[PDB]
Amino acid sequence: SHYTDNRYKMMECIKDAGRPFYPHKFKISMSLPAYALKYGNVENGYIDKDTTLSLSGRVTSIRSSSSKLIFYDIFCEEQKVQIIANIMEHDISTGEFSVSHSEIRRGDVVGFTGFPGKSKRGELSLFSKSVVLLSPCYHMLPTAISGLKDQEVRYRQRYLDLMLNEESRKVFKLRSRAIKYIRNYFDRLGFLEVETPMLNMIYGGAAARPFITYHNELETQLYMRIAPELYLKQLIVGGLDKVYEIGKNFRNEGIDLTHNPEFTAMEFYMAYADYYDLMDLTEELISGLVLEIHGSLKIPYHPDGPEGKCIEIDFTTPWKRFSFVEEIESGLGEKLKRPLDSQENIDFMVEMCEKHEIELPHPRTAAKLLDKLAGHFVETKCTNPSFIIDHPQTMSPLAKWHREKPEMTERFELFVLGKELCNAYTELNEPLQQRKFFEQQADAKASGDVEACPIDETFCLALEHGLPPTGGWGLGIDRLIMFLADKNNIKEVILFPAMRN
Template identity: 35%
Template sequence: RRDMGKSVFADLRDETDRIQVYAQKNVLGDEAFARFAHLDLGDILGVEGELFTTRTGELTVKISSYTLVAKALRPPPEKWHGLQDIEARYRQRYLDLISHPEAGARFRQRSRIVRALRRFLDDRGFLEVETPMMQAIAGGAAAKPFVTHHDALGCDLYLRIAPELFLKRLLVGGFERVYEINRNFRNEGISRRHNPEFTMLEVYQAWGDFQTMMTLAEAMIPAVAQEVFGTLDIVHRAADGASEKVIHLAPPWERKTWRELLDHAVAPGFMDWPVEKKREKAQHLGLRDIKGFEDFEVANQVFEKVVQPTLIQPIFVTHLPKELVPLAKTSKEDPATVDVFELCINGVEIAPGYSEQNDPVEQRERLLAQVGHETQKLDEDFLVALEHGMPPAGGMGLGVDRLVMLLTGAESIRDVILFPQLKPLDDSLPPIRIPEPNL
């Protein structure tokens, strides 16, 4: 606001832009002008008046009347520096959106990304469905669930860790192309790449396999990038704004086996080493807390901590050990592996995809090996569904939050989730000052 005695210039802003307004004492009258002159930054106004252009060429509304729609009792972030504390930006996202236009732009881009994903799949005959978020058995992934209790049913339920087993039931029921953009919940760690509540796109196609899903991902992600950003070259910038790296999404994307990448990054024949030698090498590479890990677990830790961070350009990592993916089909070329891929971009797994296991006998054996003695975690209803016959299928889970990070250049998952999970604060905000009634 610029006060010039008998006239005041001020800026009004909405989510699209800002416009200057001009208030005059001789037009509004003494009382209304005095109130206007004492408005606070952040007050919400409605104005009426005529448009004109100032001598400097700025479009302006000459106010004939105004209404104070809502009074701001707390000041917004300081004008020039805004909300600088990173944690405060996450806790008070509304202030972050007010003071950082680029934050609002990123969340609008997120909305457009999700719309583009839907449009891509809808145009190819996939049916969007909804599956339960509260489940009697937490299945479809190896993760710790959140537990709740349903009083009327008298039983514990779990917030879903994945929708996979319900979507496969739909394949059994004859829905041949299905997808769900879903919220998953995992009671595990928080990091710049992990939030306990996150968004996934899961898609399944009957009569497909992991190759089908690779083709789908290789077409879908570039199509979304082109539609929303108008380019397939995604620039990630350093804190000072300089270009740090460019990720090229134009297909075709590279394909390498899990074993090939480990052999190249660690040592030739690494996967054939005995487990003790693997552990020694892993510790030499800086990995800790791997004592007691099984052979495939050690190798997976080495891959995730040593190999994956180097995979910047899009690459499909294929044929993982079968112990890591119990819901996928065994590879005919190498029975120790399964027909799966992990799509890695910018050092992060963006999407895993499978040739889905549809043999009920082998699926039962694999799930029993996974749950061990905790047979109550075995989803018998899912296995019964498989026994009715599920067609061969390909499936894929795409991390929507991570895709948004990739396409917008965000370095933390908290920058692409409007209200990320944070530890509650003990201290409350200071009391507000109640203004005089005439304000």
């Protein structure tokens, strides 16, 4: 592009002519938002020639109306301000007027000094005496994201999206706001926020394939964590009673509209809670947060982008419960075989998948087949926030056996519009069973289940020191933002999402 080349040449001409080249420090008098706050309500034509002020931002517009007069718009911290540069007011010690302004291009980061007020037409303005080129833009910028080459430019060059698209900036402010609300909710309950390792000698705490790496000096392989669950429960053994953690998990899996290989999760562990308590807390936290952002519990959503239809999500509590096995059997019209992990039920579930054209998982463990059946018959019923509850033990190796239902656990997942938001349970705190389920996990992994975890002996030893009855819970922060901010693509709520190619 000839434009980038010429700009470099211009900057070389500036630097070798002794003129301002990338000044180190520009001292603004106030922000542009502060400027609009102080001066936005003056009368049209008002100017305070007794006050000199320095302002800075990115040039979004240049218009020379005459040989004597140049109009700029600059933008900074969500505020636009017009600069009126009149040759009569020009500080000639900064160079001749026409030379000073010939160095400026739309998109440049620049400073101005001048008198505050309002043009006779009512535009909030600075009547400038000087202009300083702080940081030039070397590329021709479009006017909006609509002028970009493709819309993947928004994700690969996020600075362009943030520069040109106010809706993108709003998303990441909302994301911060929601996380603040969430922290405050648990801080007020007396929780302690902790950090537990993202480098693990043994990965665990979820059904997910890990990233593998290696520590040279300790001569050992490590896994990026797929979940903090196993460390956090050890803190409850240690007596901290209420802990939470907000941070990244790493899952070496495919990317789609609701999966990024790193994502932000919150987990908390509350001694003496069970999953009934956790269901009530989930409803209270999420509906409070929805109310905080939206002013009611019925919020809009565009499932096919904003050129599509607009639906309503109703967060009114209490939310519907679906029982895992019962809702599958209602969809099938017959019962699963018992025990659920028998070879007989495994064969039956295979024949049910092929009957209902459900893509088989690999390998064909009972847990993975149950999950496929659930995704087909149950998760698709979850339009408004719904709990899917009481998952079979065989697919929940860390959830405590259900106090009433054989073969099930005290577990729930929260689903919104068929997408999973939360995973939670009464915690398994019995070491014999826990060891047994770890062995079954290790067996599945050895059979090719890349989402099954190895046995963690350190964790079994911790349970032998006595984990109090405890309730635990995990939430996908990014997926929460998708719903709060009305995005159907997770790449909209992560600043630098993973991209192919």
